[PDB]
Amino acid sequence: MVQAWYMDESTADPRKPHRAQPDRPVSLEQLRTLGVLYWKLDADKYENDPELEKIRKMRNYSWMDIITICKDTLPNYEEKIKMFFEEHLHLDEEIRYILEGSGYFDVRDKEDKWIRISMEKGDMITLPAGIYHRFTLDEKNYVKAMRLFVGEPVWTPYNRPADHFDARVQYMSFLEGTA
Ligand code: NI
């Protein structure tokens, strides 16, 4: 079962778990109220998995590639890592399917409090266009992920504040409608 939680008040060491004390876990159901959706898959089968295919056809994820984040192999690693963890939004979905390793996606809740989502091998997530979010490796310092997109990808982050965008306005309108 995928783990999410509200974060403590420490700003040091972003790769540590930062669990609030006492524990305040967050369910998949609460995540859905933020428009964040999740699927569990057999990541060993990612090259040929009818269950992944079902998701891609349903959601129109017509594009994909594979990315590996580790110090030793990713081009421009240090700057990419910094950019990932700056709070930002996109004008499209951010869909990531974890094939090896792990990481944290943090998202803002309806009161703009951080929720940390621990993503591991087999976990697939979509963060809706307009949601403020960030990503960091955890202390294992390694992740291999499939990136998916609705059509040809545009990866551009808009670092908060990015409130003027239509995608942000529509997302805010979506949040009024959920529990
Ligand atoms: Ni992003």
JSON list of N, CA, C and O in Angstrom, two decimals, residues 15 43-44 46 66-74 77 81 84 97-105 118-122 135-146:
[
{"chain": "A", "resi": 15, "resn": "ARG", "atom": "N", "xyz": [15.68, 14.93, 1.58]},
{"chain": "A", "resi": 15, "resn": "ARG", "atom": "CA", "xyz": [15.57, 13.51, 1.22]},
{"chain": "A", "resi": 15, "resn": "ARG", "atom": "C", "xyz": [15.14, 12.63, 2.38]},
{"chain": "A", "resi": 15, "resn": "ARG", "atom": "O", "xyz": [14.81, 11.46, 2.18]},
{"chain": "A", "resi": 43, "resn": "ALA", "atom": "N", "xyz": [6.06, -3.85, -12.05]},
{"chain": "A", "resi": 43, "resn": "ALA", "atom": "CA", "xyz": [7.04, -3.06, -12.78]},
{"chain": "A", "resi": 43, "resn": "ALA", "atom": "C", "xyz": [8.03, -3.94, -13.55]},
{"chain": "A", "resi": 43, "resn": "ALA", "atom": "O", "xyz": [8.70, -3.45, -14.45]},
{"chain": "A", "resi": 44, "resn": "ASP", "atom": "N", "xyz": [8.11, -5.23, -13.20]},
{"chain": "A", "resi": 44, "resn": "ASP", "atom": "CA", "xyz": [8.97, -6.13, -13.97]},
{"chain": "A", "resi": 44, "resn": "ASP", "atom": "C", "xyz": [8.44, -6.29, -15.40]},
{"chain": "A", "resi": 44, "resn": "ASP", "atom": "O", "xyz": [9.19, -6.54, -16.34]},
{"chain": "A", "resi": 46, "resn": "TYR", "atom": "N", "xyz": [7.08, -3.97, -17.38]},
{"chain": "A", "resi": 46, "resn": "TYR", "atom": "CA", "xyz": [6.75, -2.66, -17.96]},
{"chain": "A", "resi": 46, "resn": "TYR", "atom": "C", "xyz": [6.95, -2.60, -19.48]},
{"chain": "A", "resi": 46, "resn": "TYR", "atom": "O", "xyz": [6.31, -1.80, -20.15]},
{"chain": "A", "resi": 66, "resn": "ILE", "atom": "N", "xyz": [11.74, 6.63, -20.78]},
{"chain": "A", "resi": 66, "resn": "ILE", "atom": "CA", "xyz": [12.30, 6.12, -19.54]},
{"chain": "A", "resi": 66, "resn": "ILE", "atom": "C", "xyz": [13.40, 7.07, -19.10]},
{"chain": "A", "resi": 66, "resn": "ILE", "atom": "O", "xyz": [14.24, 7.47, -19.90]},
{"chain": "A", "resi": 67, "resn": "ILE", "atom": "N", "xyz": [13.40, 7.42, -17.82]},
{"chain": "A", "resi": 67, "resn": "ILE", "atom": "CA", "xyz": [14.42, 8.32, -17.31]},
{"chain": "A", "resi": 67, "resn": "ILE", "atom": "C", "xyz": [15.08, 7.66, -16.10]},
{"chain": "A", "resi": 67, "resn": "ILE", "atom": "O", "xyz": [14.41, 6.98, -15.32]},
{"chain": "A", "resi": 68, "resn": "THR", "atom": "N", "xyz": [16.39, 7.83, -15.96]},
{"chain": "A", "resi": 68, "resn": "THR", "atom": "CA", "xyz": [17.07, 7.30, -14.79]},
{"chain": "A", "resi": 68, "resn": "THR", "atom": "C", "xyz": [17.78, 8.43, -14.07]},
{"chain": "A", "resi": 68, "resn": "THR", "atom": "O", "xyz": [18.63, 9.10, -14.65]},
{"chain": "A", "resi": 69, "resn": "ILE", "atom": "N", "xyz": [17.41, 8.67, -12.82]},
{"chain": "A", "resi": 69, "resn": "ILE", "atom": "CA", "xyz": [18.02, 9.73, -12.05]},
{"chain": "A", "resi": 69, "resn": "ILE", "atom": "C", "xyz": [19.03, 9.14, -11.08]},
{"chain": "A", "resi": 69, "resn": "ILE", "atom": "O", "xyz": [18.67, 8.53, -10.07]},
{"chain": "A", "resi": 70, "resn": "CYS", "atom": "N", "xyz": [20.31, 9.30, -11.40]},
{"chain": "A", "resi": 70, "resn": "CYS", "atom": "CA", "xyz": [21.36, 9.01, -10.42]},
{"chain": "A", "resi": 70, "resn": "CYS", "atom": "C", "xyz": [22.60, 9.84, -10.79]},
{"chain": "A", "resi": 70, "resn": "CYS", "atom": "O", "xyz": [22.80, 10.17, -11.97]},
{"chain": "A", "resi": 71, "resn": "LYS", "atom": "N", "xyz": [23.38, 10.19, -9.77]},
{"chain": "A", "resi": 71, "resn": "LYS", "atom": "CA", "xyz": [24.49, 11.15, -9.90]},
{"chain": "A", "resi": 71, "resn": "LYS", "atom": "C", "xyz": [25.40, 10.84, -11.08]},
{"chain": "A", "resi": 71, "resn": "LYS", "atom": "O", "xyz": [25.89, 11.74, -11.76]},
{"chain": "A", "resi": 72, "resn": "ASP", "atom": "N", "xyz": [25.59, 9.54, -11.32]},
{"chain": "A", "resi": 72, "resn": "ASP", "atom": "CA", "xyz": [26.65, 9.05, -12.19]},
{"chain": "A", "resi": 72, "resn": "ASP", "atom": "C", "xyz": [26.30, 9.00, -13.68]},
{"chain": "A", "resi": 72, "resn": "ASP", "atom": "O", "xyz": [27.17, 8.79, -14.51]},
{"chain": "A", "resi": 73, "resn": "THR", "atom": "N", "xyz": [25.03, 9.19, -14.03]},
{"chain": "A", "resi": 73, "resn": "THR", "atom": "CA", "xyz": [24.62, 8.94, -15.41]},
{"chain": "A", "resi": 73, "resn": "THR", "atom": "C", "xyz": [23.70, 9.98, -16.02]},
{"chain": "A", "resi": 73, "resn": "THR", "atom": "O", "xyz": [23.67, 10.14, -17.24]},
{"chain": "A", "resi": 74, "resn": "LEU", "atom": "N", "xyz": [22.94, 10.70, -15.19]},
{"chain": "A", "resi": 74, "resn": "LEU", "atom": "CA", "xyz": [22.01, 11.71, -15.72]},
{"chain": "A", "resi": 74, "resn": "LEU", "atom": "C", "xyz": [22.73, 13.00, -16.12]},
{"chain": "A", "resi": 74, "resn": "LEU", "atom": "O", "xyz": [23.43, 13.60, -15.31]},
{"chain": "A", "resi": 77, "resn": "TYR", "atom": "N", "xyz": [22.86, 16.53, -13.93]},
{"chain": "A", "resi": 77, "resn": "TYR", "atom": "CA", "xyz": [22.18, 15.96, -12.78]},
{"chain": "A", "resi": 77, "resn": "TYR", "atom": "C", "xyz": [21.86, 16.99, -11.69]},
{"chain": "A", "resi": 77, "resn": "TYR", "atom": "O", "xyz": [20.71, 17.12, -11.28]},
{"chain": "A", "resi": 81, "resn": "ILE", "atom": "N", "xyz": [18.03, 18.09, -10.60]},
{"chain": "A", "resi": 81, "resn": "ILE", "atom": "CA", "xyz": [17.62, 17.80, -9.22]},
{"chain": "A", "resi": 81, "resn": "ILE", "atom": "C", "xyz": [17.11, 19.02, -8.46]},
{"chain": "A", "resi": 81, "resn": "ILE", "atom": "O", "xyz": [16.09, 18.96, -7.75]},
{"chain": "A", "resi": 84, "resn": "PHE", "atom": "N", "xyz": [13.74, 20.00, -10.06]},
{"chain": "A", "resi": 84, "resn": "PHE", "atom": "CA", "xyz": [12.66, 19.09, -9.64]},
{"chain": "A", "resi": 84, "resn": "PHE", "atom": "C", "xyz": [12.06, 19.49, -8.30]},
{"chain": "A", "resi": 84, "resn": "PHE", "atom": "O", "xyz": [10.85, 19.35, -8.11]},
{"chain": "A", "resi": 97, "resn": "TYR", "atom": "N", "xyz": [5.70, 6.55, -13.63]},
{"chain": "A", "resi": 97, "resn": "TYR", "atom": "CA", "xyz": [5.56, 5.15, -13.26]},
{"chain": "A", "resi": 97, "resn": "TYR", "atom": "C", "xyz": [6.93, 4.65, -12.81]},
{"chain": "A", "resi": 97, "resn": "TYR", "atom": "O", "xyz": [7.88, 4.61, -13.60]},
{"chain": "A", "resi": 98, "resn": "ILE", "atom": "N", "xyz": [7.04, 4.28, -11.53]},
{"chain": "A", "resi": 98, "resn": "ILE", "atom": "CA", "xyz": [8.35, 3.94, -10.96]},
{"chain": "A", "resi": 98, "resn": "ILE", "atom": "C", "xyz": [8.74, 2.50, -11.30]},
{"chain": "A", "resi": 98, "resn": "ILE", "atom": "O", "xyz": [8.03, 1.56, -10.92]},
{"chain": "A", "resi": 99, "resn": "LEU", "atom": "N", "xyz": [9.86, 2.34, -11.99]},
{"chain": "A", "resi": 99, "resn": "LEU", "atom": "CA", "xyz": [10.31, 1.02, -12.45]},
{"chain": "A", "resi": 99, "resn": "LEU", "atom": "C", "xyz": [11.36, 0.40, -11.52]},
{"chain": "A", "resi": 99, "resn": "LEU", "atom": "O", "xyz": [11.39, -0.82, -11.34]},
{"chain": "A", "resi": 100, "resn": "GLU", "atom": "N", "xyz": [12.22, 1.24, -10.97]},
{"chain": "A", "resi": 100, "resn": "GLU", "atom": "CA", "xyz": [13.21, 0.81, -9.96]},
{"chain": "A", "resi": 100, "resn": "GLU", "atom": "C", "xyz": [13.44, 1.95, -9.00]},
{"chain": "A", "resi": 100, "resn": "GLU", "atom": "O", "xyz": [13.27, 3.11, -9.37]},
{"chain": "A", "resi": 101, "resn": "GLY", "atom": "N", "xyz": [13.85, 1.64, -7.77]},
{"chain": "A", "resi": 101, "resn": "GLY", "atom": "CA", "xyz": [14.20, 2.70, -6.84]},
{"chain": "A", "resi": 101, "resn": "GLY", "atom": "C", "xyz": [12.98, 3.40, -6.29]},
{"chain": "A", "resi": 101, "resn": "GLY", "atom": "O", "xyz": [11.92, 2.80, -6.16]},
{"chain": "A", "resi": 102, "resn": "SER", "atom": "N", "xyz": [13.12, 4.68, -5.95]},
{"chain": "A", "resi": 102, "resn": "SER", "atom": "CA", "xyz": [12.03, 5.34, -5.26]},
{"chain": "A", "resi": 102, "resn": "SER", "atom": "C", "xyz": [12.25, 6.83, -5.13]},
{"chain": "A", "resi": 102, "resn": "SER", "atom": "O", "xyz": [13.33, 7.35, -5.45]},
{"chain": "A", "resi": 103, "resn": "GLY", "atom": "N", "xyz": [11.21, 7.53, -4.67]},
{"chain": "A", "resi": 103, "resn": "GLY", "atom": "CA", "xyz": [11.31, 8.97, -4.51]},
{"chain": "A", "resi": 103, "resn": "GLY", "atom": "C", "xyz": [10.08, 9.54, -3.83]},
{"chain": "A", "resi": 103, "resn": "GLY", "atom": "O", "xyz": [9.15, 8.80, -3.49]},
{"chain": "A", "resi": 104, "resn": "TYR", "atom": "N", "xyz": [10.10, 10.85, -3.61]},
{"chain": "A", "resi": 104, "resn": "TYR", "atom": "CA", "xyz": [9.01, 11.56, -2.98]},
{"chain": "A", "resi": 104, "resn": "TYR", "atom": "C", "xyz": [8.45, 12.58, -3.94]},
{"chain": "A", "resi": 104, "resn": "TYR", "atom": "O", "xyz": [9.20, 13.40, -4.47]},
{"chain": "A", "resi": 105, "resn": "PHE", "atom": "N", "xyz": [7.13, 12.54, -4.15]},
{"chain": "A", "resi": 105, "resn": "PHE", "atom": "CA", "xyz": [6.42, 13.66, -4.77]},
{"chain": "A", "resi": 105, "resn": "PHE", "atom": "C", "xyz": [5.65, 14.38, -3.67]},
{"chain": "A", "resi": 105, "resn": "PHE", "atom": "O", "xyz": [4.82, 13.78, -2.98]},
{"chain": "A", "resi": 118, "resn": "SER", "atom": "N", "xyz": [5.22, 8.86, -0.97]},
{"chain": "A", "resi": 118, "resn": "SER", "atom": "CA", "xyz": [6.35, 7.97, -1.17]},
{"chain": "A", "resi": 118, "resn": "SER", "atom": "C", "xyz": [6.07, 7.00, -2.32]},
{"chain": "A", "resi": 118, "resn": "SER", "atom": "O", "xyz": [5.23, 6.11, -2.18]},
{"chain": "A", "resi": 119, "resn": "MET", "atom": "N", "xyz": [6.77, 7.18, -3.43]},
{"chain": "A", "resi": 119, "resn": "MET", "atom": "CA", "xyz": [6.58, 6.36, -4.63]},
{"chain": "A", "resi": 119, "resn": "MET", "atom": "C", "xyz": [7.69, 5.33, -4.78]},
{"chain": "A", "resi": 119, "resn": "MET", "atom": "O", "xyz": [8.88, 5.68, -4.80]},
{"chain": "A", "resi": 120, "resn": "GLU", "atom": "N", "xyz": [7.31, 4.06, -4.90]},
{"chain": "A", "resi": 120, "resn": "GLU", "atom": "CA", "xyz": [8.26, 2.97, -5.06]},
{"chain": "A", "resi": 120, "resn": "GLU", "atom": "C", "xyz": [7.98, 2.13, -6.29]},
{"chain": "A", "resi": 120, "resn": "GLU", "atom": "O", "xyz": [6.99, 2.35, -6.98]},
{"chain": "A", "resi": 121, "resn": "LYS", "atom": "N", "xyz": [8.84, 1.14, -6.53]},
{"chain": "A", "resi": 121, "resn": "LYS", "atom": "CA", "xyz": [8.72, 0.27, -7.70]},
{"chain": "A", "resi": 121, "resn": "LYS", "atom": "C", "xyz": [7.31, -0.27, -7.80]},
{"chain": "A", "resi": 121, "resn": "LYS", "atom": "O", "xyz": [6.77, -0.80, -6.83]},
{"chain": "A", "resi": 122, "resn": "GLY", "atom": "N", "xyz": [6.69, -0.11, -8.97]},
{"chain": "A", "resi": 122, "resn": "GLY", "atom": "CA", "xyz": [5.33, -0.60, -9.19]},
{"chain": "A", "resi": 122, "resn": "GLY", "atom": "C", "xyz": [4.27, 0.48, -9.08]},
{"chain": "A", "resi": 122, "resn": "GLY", "atom": "O", "xyz": [3.13, 0.28, -9.50]},
{"chain": "A", "resi": 135, "resn": "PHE", "atom": "N", "xyz": [9.51, 17.29, -6.54]},
{"chain": "A", "resi": 135, "resn": "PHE", "atom": "CA", "xyz": [10.01, 15.93, -6.45]},
{"chain": "A", "resi": 135, "resn": "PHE", "atom": "C", "xyz": [11.43, 15.91, -5.91]},
{"chain": "A", "resi": 135, "resn": "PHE", "atom": "O", "xyz": [12.26, 16.75, -6.27]},
{"chain": "A", "resi": 136, "resn": "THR", "atom": "N", "xyz": [11.71, 14.93, -5.06]},
{"chain": "A", "resi": 136, "resn": "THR", "atom": "CA", "xyz": [13.06, 14.66, -4.62]},
{"chain": "A", "resi": 136, "resn": "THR", "atom": "C", "xyz": [13.31, 13.16, -4.51]},
{"chain": "A", "resi": 136, "resn": "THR", "atom": "O", "xyz": [12.39, 12.39, -4.20]},
{"chain": "A", "resi": 137, "resn": "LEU", "atom": "N", "xyz": [14.54, 12.74, -4.78]},
{"chain": "A", "resi": 137, "resn": "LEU", "atom": "CA", "xyz": [14.97, 11.41, -4.39]},
{"chain": "A", "resi": 137, "resn": "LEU", "atom": "C", "xyz": [14.83, 11.26, -2.88]},
{"chain": "A", "resi": 137, "resn": "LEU", "atom": "O", "xyz": [14.80, 12.27, -2.15]},
{"chain": "A", "resi": 138, "resn": "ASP", "atom": "N", "xyz": [14.71, 10.03, -2.41]},
{"chain": "A", "resi": 138, "resn": "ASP", "atom": "CA", "xyz": [14.81, 9.79, -0.98]},
{"chain": "A", "resi": 138, "resn": "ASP", "atom": "C", "xyz": [16.27, 9.44, -0.66]},
{"chain": "A", "resi": 138, "resn": "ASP", "atom": "O", "xyz": [17.17, 9.68, -1.46]},
{"chain": "A", "resi": 139, "resn": "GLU", "atom": "N", "xyz": [16.51, 8.87, 0.51]},
{"chain": "A", "resi": 139, "resn": "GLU", "atom": "CA", "xyz": [17.89, 8.68, 0.95]},
{"chain": "A", "resi": 139, "resn": "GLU", "atom": "C", "xyz": [18.62, 7.58, 0.18]},
{"chain": "A", "resi": 139, "resn": "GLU", "atom": "O", "xyz": [19.85, 7.48, 0.26]},
{"chain": "A", "resi": 140, "resn": "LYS", "atom": "N", "xyz": [17.88, 6.79, -0.59]},
{"chain": "A", "resi": 140, "resn": "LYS", "atom": "CA", "xyz": [18.51, 5.77, -1.43]},
{"chain": "A", "resi": 140, "resn": "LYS", "atom": "C", "xyz": [19.11, 6.37, -2.70]},
{"chain": "A", "resi": 140, "resn": "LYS", "atom": "O", "xyz": [19.86, 5.71, -3.41]},
{"chain": "A", "resi": 141, "resn": "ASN", "atom": "N", "xyz": [18.76, 7.62, -2.98]},
{"chain": "A", "resi": 141, "resn": "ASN", "atom": "CA", "xyz": [19.37, 8.38, -4.06]},
{"chain": "A", "resi": 141, "resn": "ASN", "atom": "C", "xyz": [19.35, 7.71, -5.43]},
{"chain": "A", "resi": 141, "resn": "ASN", "atom": "O", "xyz": [20.32, 7.79, -6.18]},
{"chain": "A", "resi": 142, "resn": "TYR", "atom": "N", "xyz": [18.22, 7.09, -5.76]},
{"chain": "A", "resi": 142, "resn": "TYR", "atom": "CA", "xyz": [18.09, 6.45, -7.06]},
{"chain": "A", "resi": 142, "resn": "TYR", "atom": "C", "xyz": [16.63, 6.21, -7.44]},
{"chain": "A", "resi": 142, "resn": "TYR", "atom": "O", "xyz": [15.83, 5.73, -6.63]},
{"chain": "A", "resi": 143, "resn": "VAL", "atom": "N", "xyz": [16.29, 6.57, -8.67]},
{"chain": "A", "resi": 143, "resn": "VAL", "atom": "CA", "xyz": [14.99, 6.18, -9.22]},
{"chain": "A", "resi": 143, "resn": "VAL", "atom": "C", "xyz": [15.09, 5.99, -10.72]},
{"chain": "A", "resi": 143, "resn": "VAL", "atom": "O", "xyz": [15.83, 6.71, -11.41]},
{"chain": "A", "resi": 144, "resn": "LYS", "atom": "N", "xyz": [14.37, 4.98, -11.22]},
{"chain": "A", "resi": 144, "resn": "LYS", "atom": "CA", "xyz": [14.17, 4.75, -12.65]},
{"chain": "A", "resi": 144, "resn": "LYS", "atom": "C", "xyz": [12.67, 4.85, -12.92]},
{"chain": "A", "resi": 144, "resn": "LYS", "atom": "O", "xyz": [11.89, 4.14, -12.28]},
{"chain": "A", "resi": 145, "resn": "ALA", "atom": "N", "xyz": [12.28, 5.73, -13.83]},
{"chain": "A", "resi": 145, "resn": "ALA", "atom": "CA", "xyz": [10.85, 5.98, -14.01]},
{"chain": "A", "resi": 145, "resn": "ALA", "atom": "C", "xyz": [10.47, 6.05, -15.47]},
{"chain": "A", "resi": 145, "resn": "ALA", "atom": "O", "xyz": [11.25, 6.49, -16.32]},
{"chain": "A", "resi": 146, "resn": "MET", "atom": "N", "xyz": [9.25, 5.61, -15.76]},
{"chain": "A", "resi": 146, "resn": "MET", "atom": "CA", "xyz": [8.66, 5.86, -17.05]},
{"chain": "A", "resi": 146, "resn": "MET", "atom": "C", "xyz": [7.91, 7.19, -16.96]},
{"chain": "A", "resi": 146, "resn": "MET", "atom": "O", "xyz": [7.13, 7.39, -16.04]}
]
